[PDB]
Each structure stands twice: as C-alpha cells, then as structure tokens.
Write an enzyme that holds these catalytic residues in place. Sequence first.
Site, PDB file in Angstrom:
ATOM      1  N   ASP C  64      31.766  57.773  29.884  1.00 24.64           N
ATOM      2  CA  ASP C  64      33.051  57.862  30.571  1.00 24.64           C
ATOM      3  C   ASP C  64      34.202  58.094  29.593  1.00 24.64           C
ATOM      4  O   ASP C  64      35.367  58.112  29.985  1.00 24.64           O
ATOM      5  CB  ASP C  64      33.305  56.598  31.394  1.00 24.64           C
ATOM      6  CG  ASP C  64      33.460  55.361  30.532  1.00 24.64           C
ATOM      7  OD1 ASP C  64      32.957  55.357  29.388  1.00 24.64           O
ATOM      8  OD2 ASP C  64      34.084  54.387  31.003  1.00 24.64           O
ATOM      9  N   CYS C  67      33.140  55.044  25.003  1.00 25.66           N
ATOM     10  CA  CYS C  67      31.961  54.471  24.361  1.00 25.66           C
ATOM     11  C   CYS C  67      32.312  53.725  23.076  1.00 25.66           C
ATOM     12  O   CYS C  67      31.648  52.755  22.713  1.00 25.66           O
ATOM     13  CB  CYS C  67      30.924  55.561  24.073  1.00 25.66           C
ATOM     14  SG  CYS C  67      31.492  56.907  23.007  1.00 25.66           S
ATOM     15  N   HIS C 209      28.337  60.012  20.644  1.00 26.86           N
ATOM     16  CA  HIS C 209      28.252  58.732  21.340  1.00 26.86           C
ATOM     17  C   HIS C 209      28.353  57.564  20.365  1.00 26.86           C
ATOM     18  O   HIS C 209      27.865  57.639  19.238  1.00 26.86           O
ATOM     19  CB  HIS C 209      26.945  58.625  22.131  1.00 26.86           C
ATOM     20  CG  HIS C 209      26.892  59.495  23.346  1.00 26.86           C
ATOM     21  ND1 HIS C 209      26.532  60.827  23.296  1.00 26.86           N
ATOM     22  CD2 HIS C 209      27.140  59.225  24.650  1.00 26.86           C
ATOM     23  CE1 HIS C 209      26.567  61.337  24.512  1.00 26.86           C
ATOM     24  NE2 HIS C 209      26.934  60.385  25.354  1.00 26.86           N
TER      25      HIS C 209
END
EC number: 3.4.19.12
Lengths: 75, 71, 286
Positions: C64, C67, C209
């Site tokens: 979203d 992270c 990420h």
Amino acid sequence: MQIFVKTLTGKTITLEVEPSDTIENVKAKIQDKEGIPPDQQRLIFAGKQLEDGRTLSDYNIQKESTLHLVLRLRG
Amino acid sequence: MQIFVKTLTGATITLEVEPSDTIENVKAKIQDKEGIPPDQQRLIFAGKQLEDGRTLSDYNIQKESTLHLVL
Amino acid sequence: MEMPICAFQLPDLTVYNEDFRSFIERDLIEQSMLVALEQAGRLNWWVSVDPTSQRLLPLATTGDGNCLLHAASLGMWGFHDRDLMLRKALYALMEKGVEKEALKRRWRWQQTQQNKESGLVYTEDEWQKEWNELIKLASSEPREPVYESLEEFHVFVLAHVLRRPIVVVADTMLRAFAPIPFGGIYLPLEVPASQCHRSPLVLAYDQAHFSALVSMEQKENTKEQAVIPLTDSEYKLLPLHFAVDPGKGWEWGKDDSDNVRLASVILSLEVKLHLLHSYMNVKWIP
C-alpha cells in the site's frame, strides 16, 4: 536512430529512438526493457538532468549519442 | 506454491499458499499485507470471483498465478 | 579476524499496541524476500561464521506504499493507524522539523558527491526541485488508499522520527544493472545519542519492498536479543548513510570543487566507528 543508455554499473542499453520522441517516451522505452518506472529514472546527457517535457530535439542528439541513466529507487 | 495479488495502484503482493487453501486463508494473508478486512475483499481470478468455502484448486489456481484484489 | 556486530532487541511497542507481541507471532514471513536475500548472500551469512547468532527472518511486507513505515510496527495493527501517523511525522520533520536545516545539508552533500559519478551538476533551481520532490513523496496524498513509495533519504529521516538507528539488509546491485542504495546503516545523528533508543531497527529490502528482520525466538517471544553484523559478508564496514555534514560554512559552489575541502569532511574509519559506538552497542567477535 540508435542511442545508448549507460548506467553506473557500466551496462550499455541500445534503444531504438527518434528525435520526435521526448524524455518521457525514452523512460517509457527503458521501462519496457528494464522494468524500471519512469519516475524512478533520471536521464543525464552532457552533464544536465533532462526534462520529461522537452523532446530529444530540444537537446543535442546523434546516431552515437550516449545518455547516462541514474535511478531513484523507492521502497 | 507461490501466487500473486495485484491491485489497481498498489504494489504486487506475493503469497505462499497451497492448492488446498481456502479463500478465507488467502484473505487472512492478504489482510496481513494490505490491511483490508476479509469481508471487504473481493478476489478475482480468470474472470471468476473467489467465494469463501471454496479452495484455490476449485478455481484451478496454478503456480505463479495472479489474483486481482478489489473492494 | 574479528567483525563488529550489534546485539539488538525488538522495539517495545506496548504504548502503541499492548498486544503487539502477539501480532509478531501471528505475522507471516516474507518467504520470497528471505530466499532472495539469502541466496544473494546478504542475509544470514553470519550464522556459519558466528555461532550464538540466530537467523533473521523478514516479516510480511505490504503493498500500500507504507511498507517502510509498516516495518516500524512489526505487525498487522499498524495498517489503519500508525503507518500513516509515521508517514505524517516523516513529512513534518522534513518541512518544519528543528533539525531539517542540517538534514538538508547531509542530503545535498551526499547527492552532490554521487552526482559526480554521472557527470551531473545540479543548478540551484534543480536542487530546490529535487528537495520538494522528496517531501512530496512523504505526503499522504493517495494514488484502498495507496501512497507513494519512499527513497533512501526517507529512511534516514525515519531514523530521526523513531529516534533509533536503522540497519537495512539488502543487495548492492540490481539484477548488475544499477546500484541499490538502501543497504547500510542509518543513524539519527541530529538527535543526541543519549536521547535515542539503543537497540537498532533491523530491516530488509528486496524488489521495492521493506520488511522488519526478526529472529525465530524473537518472533515466538522466547528470546529478547538477536545479532546483526555491521559489515557485509566480506567483512567490509556497512555504508553510513548521510553521515557527513559539511556544516553551515560550506559554500556549495566552491567547496564541492575543492579536493582539500572535501577531504576535510570525508569521514575516516575511526570517525565512522565512533559514530556507530555512540548510537549502538557494538561488540567485536572473533
């Protein structure tokens, strides 16, 4: 024509291109070849950070013009 | 087994699942990585809407398959 | 024949969520990131050479856009409160922070140095444009709300927001197409070490990420402490991100071109080790 996008690792990327194309279009071509999002790309030629709005005609270009690619990776 | 969950603008979620996993099991995993409560999750694969009570194998989700998350 | 490590514990997040420990045990493991960084030799290389050191496993990453902030909560509970609060705090510290003037010097100096590697020379207007872009990324404007992903410098600001060191485990090159800038050590240098958390926040980066790194016993709540080395697998000291501050008396035009001036602000090994020992408990093991 044919230009070369050089990275900091020394990897040379041969990209199909035309003077009509803009930097936004070049970054789009890089994304199709390397998977890197255009907003995380900084194209540098002759010491100047190129603008997405301006075209390849705005700056100088040739059949052997080498561009420098700098990344702004995001997590 | 590894599958993927795509959203309209968010990052692609990677899940480790099994063919026998229920949709509730997948939604519980998606909730852990997207923060969306399971009852507010709508999952789509190959035009099929993944309904609770069924498994991934019932929709024939394969290895490296890609689910589509939507509210 | 001895490497510097750091014995860390998981952050006490009681005041934010009293059942946070339970969310750690409940949490998934980012198996994709675990395998990637292990086979790249960046993660858990130390287990074989350093006994009495547990394996570090990545917690579940998010998709979203938060992270990085979500990793500071180490659980599912962050999603609809803290993750956005930390993002807002990140934005605030860059715009109206009391140390924002010094944070900007640290950012610009490193960016100027790295700009040489490509022959890039920013104008004074381009510098203003790049700084505004960084702050814009930390905004809470969406586009299920999805937020903009954050850059290297945002990790450095996060260290100041959390008032604790951040150690990122990541690869050095992109699969070698381009350098990955996230790996290394982030110290809240604009915050007095005495007013910082001693134990660092250990993170992992892979494929755009971020994830928190925990040991198995730290996840099941059976042991408080784990070990993170402050070097790579080749025992070279980890990069200190934005550690150099040239100061207010640093004229950007002239001094950047002056090799003598640059040498006077470039940190030695002795200085780097002092900074590490100031914000972290650095133990040397054979």
